[PDB]
C-alpha cells in the first residue's frame, strides 16, 4: 500500500513552467520526508528538492542546479507533494521521480515513483502515426511476426507499448526511438506469436501511451 504516483510532464519551452505532482498513498504522508530526484538522459540520478515531516516544520532543501527556480510544497490535506519548476532550460530534460526518504536505523529511499518525463524544447508536439507491420502470406514461416511502426513524433519522452495479446509463446520487442530527418523520432514494436494465435482476418491491437497523453491504437492484421 506504500505507493507514490507522479504526474505533470511533457514538452515545455525554454522559459516555461510545470507543476509536477506526486500522489502519495498507503502511509501517513504528514511526517515522512519526500524527495525529488531527476535522471537526465545518459546520466546519474541527481537529487533536487526535499520536504520534511510535519515534524520539524516542512523545511526544504534544494540542489545548486535548481535552488532559485524550483519550489517544493505539499498539500497536506490531500497528500500530494508538488514541484513547481520555473524558468526551465534544456538542461532540465529528465525523468523526475519522487521518493520517500525513510529513517529507521539509517536513512534510505524505500519507495520510488515510476517517473514522469519533462522535455524542455523549443520544438513542438507531433503525435506518432502508427503504421501496421505485416507480411504477405509469402513471408510468414510461422511464428507470425507483426508490429507497429510508431512514426515521426516529438518529444521522445516515454513510450509504453502493449499488445492485445499475451501468454506463454508471444514475445514483444519495443525498440528505443531514433532521431530521423526533421528532429523527430521513430520506434517500432514487434510481437511474435504462435501462428494459430494469429491466423487470418483476426488482428491484434497495439497500444501506444506517450508521456502524458491519451492511448492511441491500431489493429494489425496477422
Amino acid at each position: 500500500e506504500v505507493k507514490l504516483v507522479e504526474s505533470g510532464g511533457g514538452l515545455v519551452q525554454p522559459g516555461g513552467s510545470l507543476r509536477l505532482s506526486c500522489a502519495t498513498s498507503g502511509f501517513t504522508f504528514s511526517d515522512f520526508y519526500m524527495e525529488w530526484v531527476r535522471q537526465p538522459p545518459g546520466k546519474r540520478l541527481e537529487w533536487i528538492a526535499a520536504s520534511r515531516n510535519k515534524g520539524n516544520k516542512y523545511t526544504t532543501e534544494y540542489s545548486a542546479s535548481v535552488k532559485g527556480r524550483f519550489i517544493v510544497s505539499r498539500d497536506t490535506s490531500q497528500s500530494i507533494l508538488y514541484l513547481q519548476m520555473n524558468a526551465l532550460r534544456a538542461e532540465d530534460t529528465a525523468i523526475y521521480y519522487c521518493a520517500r526518504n525513510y529513517y529507521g536505523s539509517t536513512w534510505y529511499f524505500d519507495v520510488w515513483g515510476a517517473g514522469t518525463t519533462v522535455t524542455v524544447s523549443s520544438e513542438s508536439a507531433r503525435n506518432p502515426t502508427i503504421y501496421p507491420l505485416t507480411l504477405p502470406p509469402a513471408l510468414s514461416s510461422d511464428p507470425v511476426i507483426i508490429g507497429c511502426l510508431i512514426h515521426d513524433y516529438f518529444p521522445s519522452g516515454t513510450m509504453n507499448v502493449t499488445w492485445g495479446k499475451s501468454g506463454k509463446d508471444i514475445t514483444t520487442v519495443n525498440f528505443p526511438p531514433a532521431l530521423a530527418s526533421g528532429g523527430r523520432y521513430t520506434m517500432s514494436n514487434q510481437l511474435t506469436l504462435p501462428a494459430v494465435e494469429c491466423p487470418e482476418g483476426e488482428s491484434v491491437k497495439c497500444s501506444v501511451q506517450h508521456d502524458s497523453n491519451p492511448v492511441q491504437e491500431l489493429d494489425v492484421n496477422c
Binding site: 524527495e35 546519474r44 540520478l45 541527481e46 537529487w47 526535499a50 532543501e61 540542489s63 545548486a64 521521480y97 526518504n101 536505523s105 539509517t106 536513512w107 534510505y108 529511499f109 524505500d110 520510488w112 515513483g113 515510476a114 517517473g115 503504421y131 501496421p132 507491420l133 505485416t134 507480411l135 504477405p136 513471408l139 511476426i145 508490429g147 511502426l149 512514426h151 520487442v173 525498440f175 528505443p176 526511438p177 531514433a178 530521423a180 530527418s181 521513430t186 520506434m187 517500432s188 514487434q190
Partner: protein, 220 residues
C-alpha cells in the same frame, strides 16, 4: 558536496560468476554516535525506477535474493552478487544518504556474456497506409543475437547503401542476454516506387555468409 566514486563502471560477466563493484565517498557516512553508515545501494533495471537493494552498508532489503551482500564502513563500501543471473542486468547506484545534497555515484552496468547466438532476420515492406502520404519505410528486424556488434547493409535495388537509414539496438534481454536491433530505410513513395528488389543483409561474427532477408516488389 560529498562525491561517491563507483568503479568499474561497466562489468561483463558470464553469470554463475561472483562479482564486486565498489563505491568510496570523499567523506565519512558513519555517525560518531549510533555507528551506522548512511549508504544505500539501488538496482535500476533497463526502463524501470531504482529499487532498494542494501541500506546501512549491509542490510539486504526483504525480498532481495541472498546473492546480494554489501560490506564496508567509513569511506570504502562494496556490493558482491554471488552468482550472476540474467535478471541481474542493471545499473547499481550507491548513494550518500548522510547529508544534503544527497549524492549518487556514476553507476556500474552489469552485462552478461553468453555463447554466440545468431540472428533471425525479417523484412517488412512499406505499408500502403503510409505510401498514401509521401514516405515508404522498409523495416528490418534482427532478433536474438550475441555479441551485439552487427553491421547491417541496405542495398536498395542494385547494390546501394546510405544515410537514409536508422538503426536501434535493444537492451540485453534479461532472459537470454541476446540483443535485437531494427534497421529502417525510409525513402519517398516516388523514390521508393523506382527500384523494386529490396534487401537487408547482416554480417555477424557467428556465420561467415552475410545474412540477407530480401524482397522485391513495388510495382504492386
Amino acid at each position: 558536496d560529498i562525491v561517491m566514486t563507483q568503479s568499474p563502471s561497466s562489468l561483463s560477466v558470464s553469470a554463475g560468476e561472483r562479482v564486486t563493484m565498489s563505491c568510496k565517498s570523499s567523506q565519512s557516512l558513519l555517525n560518531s554516535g549510533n555507528q551506522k553508515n548512511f549508504l544505500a545501494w539501488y538496482q535500476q533495471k533497463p526502463g524501470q525506477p531504482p529499487k532498494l537493494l542494501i541500506y546501512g552498508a549491509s542490510t539486504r532489503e526483504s525480498g532481495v535474493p541472498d546473492r546480494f551482500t554489501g560490506s564496508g564502513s567509513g569511506t570504502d563500501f562494496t556490493l558482491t552478487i554471488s552468482s550472476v543471473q540474467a535478471e541481474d542486468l542493471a545499473v547499481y547506484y550507491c548513494q550518500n544518504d548522510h547529508s544534503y545534497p544527497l549524492t549518487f555515484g556514476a553507476g556500474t552496468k552489469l552485462e552478461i556474456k553468453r555463447a554466440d547466438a545468431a540472428p533471425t532476420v525479417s523484412i517488412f515492406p512499406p505499408s500502403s497506409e503510409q505510401l498514401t502520404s509521401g514516405g515508404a519505410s522498409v523495416v528490418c528486424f534482427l532478433n536474438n543475437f550475441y555479441p551485439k556488434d552487427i553491421n547491417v547493409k541496405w542495398k536498395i535495388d542494385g547494390s546501394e547503401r546510405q544515410n537514409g537509414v536508422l538503426n536501434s539496438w535493444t537492451d540485453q534481454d534479461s532472459k537470454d542476454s541476446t540483443y535485437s536491433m531494427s534497421s529502417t530505410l525510409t525513402l519517398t513513395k516516388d523514390e521508393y516506387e523506382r527500384h523494386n528488389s529490396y534487401t537487408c543483409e547482416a554480417t555477424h561474427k557467428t556465420s561467415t555468409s552475410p545474412i540477407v532477408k530480401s524482397f522485391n516488389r513495388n510495382e504492386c
